[PDB]
Assembly symmetry: D3
Homo-oligomer: 149 residues x 6
């Protein structure tokens, strides 16, 4: 139940008024929010986040879009939260996503897919370290922890 993942609401999700609904999906599931901030990060940070894609033809445009508005950055904690978080977000391409997921409810275009979620435990650790100062993670205990686990 200590696993953590990085979930980010991308500029299109913020612009389209989806902060509340997206948070609610994770909150209602029983996962614990341990960090959150609204940020407009520097270009260098976005280039590091997508470092594995730096040689793709779409990299410059992806970085430009991720700079084009605010981002709601979050760390969520709970059992299997990386993989289950990806399941809640739905398929990366919304055309392949299931209604009932975030992208299956709210998105159409893979290049405007509303949100990001870490794709692995190790990548989650790297992304958490990239987007948050260590002191921004909040230690607390949910009143319903023993009813969720």
């Amino acid at each position: 139940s200590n696993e953590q993942t990085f979930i980010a609401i991308k500029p299109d999700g913020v612009q389209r008024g989806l902060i509340g609904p997206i948070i609610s999906r994770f909150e209602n599931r029983g996962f614990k929010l341990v960090a959150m901030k609204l940020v407009s990060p520097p270009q260098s940070q976005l280039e590091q986040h997508y470092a594995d894609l730096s040689d793709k033809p779409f990299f410059k445009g992806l970085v430009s879009y991720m700079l084009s508005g605010p981002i709601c950055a979050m760390v969520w904690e709970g059992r299997d939260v990386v993989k289950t978080g990806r399941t809640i977000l739905g398929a990366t391409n919304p055309l392949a996503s299931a209604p009932g997921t975030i992208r299956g409810d709210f998105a159409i275009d893979v290049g405007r897919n509303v949100c990001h979620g870490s794709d692995s435990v190790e990548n989650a650790k790297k992304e958490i370290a990239l987007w948050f100062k260590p002191e921004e993670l909040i230690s607390w205990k949910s009143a319903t922890f023993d009813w969720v686990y």
Copy 2:
């Protein structure tokens, strides 16, 4: 993003108070409503709509049910809206549909499955031409088009 599909809320969907929720599924996804009207169409129009099924034993009863109350007829526009619209509606037989879809949330009986969606691009074109006068399609641009695509 110019593809269009015909979505109709059937008399059971209207009767059961599902107009708002059904519209919201397509609206929240990012698709654009370009035509809509509440109609009680003539029998001839319903027989033409289901022309491919005219030799089925259930055809007369299907037509009678489709005449038994108002229908909310709609044209929705967006990328892959025909196939993704069918995915949002869920399996034609609600027993085979997934929770999170319209039929998986709201319907039980294949003969009372709340809504219709075109099954192909070409059939969508035929259905749009059948149910709407050409001037009833509205040309407009969504303020969030560049955030959806």
Copy 3:
């Protein structure tokens, strides 16, 4: 229970993705939808709709805004639907409206107040005649009429 009112979702309501929610407020209350269409009406029709305001300094801009996108025009039927419809919409100025109403949930600016509702029975009759052809009103009986009245 035969009283009718004209409710219109203005271009800002359509643009902001509020068709579904607004319909749901009236639908969930128990009122009966007897006419609906998505329309981009001619300027002359909008000038007639706001004829009582034709001498106001804001008239030209109001007409221009009402022409600036599609409108979801509706006729709703039920007991006291004119006055109760106005109550559901909330105060014309959203700053004076109560949370729980359409404007108190969704709007800020009196000039962008998302929706219109007839202000009297007689004005409702005039507005229904202006916006709808008489054949566009649908006669039907709700399956739950005797549970609402």
Copy 4:
């Protein structure tokens, strides 16, 4: 449409404020509630309910958890309500469940999976007989029965 299933909201579902939402899933689908009560049943009743699991190492702890708070016991009626009810609940292990189901929206841990549903028609009959006195099942006809079937 006469098939019945036993659905129970477990103590964790009650504690986490999920009675309303869970009821709504079945209600919105078109199934008919024919029995319901909030109960804190005796240990003997819970041991009989899970009799098929009495030799499992987790049996004592399962019984203790099921005694640890109130349970919302329900009988729902409709076509294929046993299997479709299980589909609405989602996979028994929430990690394997789909967003859009009860467990895929609300639960994480198989030992805290919020709700129970009969796994077969015959087991439903046994569970209904166990949890309800025969007079607690209510005979009524939904006003929209002929619009659901």
Copy 5:
């Protein structure tokens, strides 16, 4: 926080599929459900419930309507739950009720106002004693009690 009130979803509320939403209003507010059952009570019980109205011309019809379908009977517990429960239900006449309340969201006719709530602490005690056997009230402690009070 020990005050209790009797809330009943009337046959029209059950018929119109409002059990879930109504429960959610009280559940989300922080009140504690301590008793609930779906019941079709005898005529004598309904006549005793409305004993103070037995000389009204509408008494026979009121009793007949309250017998015409199932009722979801509930006891809710919390600070000021009688008066605040009445506030959540809204004005007895839905025409005088505020959107955001149960009747202001869901009802039109005072004779079909979806729900009942005790009008005073003493009447709540009488109604609880009338509708529930004393053993049907469940003693439990909410995991979030100290976060609500």
Copy 6:
């Protein structure tokens, strides 16, 4: 439309899973989120926030409760957002609040009223300066600004 207010979800709101819903109220209204972070601030900061109440008998307990879990701190921007934000939150004492507001939907006890909102423009400025570093306010333009104003 440049006015700003400080809205904070208190530890009870976070604990009870209300971050998403509360954000949605402001988001759906049309206000712009310009700053947000999840924080567990130092005692000194909470004592400064409630400096005007430092001589009240309840001050120590209020500070202790505000330290007892995380807080979701936010800056929202829009016309009349201070006063309208207070209206959205509802009366400070939830017993005096209207259903449809945050406290009228979610809270009971004035000492556990889920959220804080600045009570004046000048106090909002002081609170924004207290809770946020100046660089944490994000400059951006909503895609629907001209449809809200």
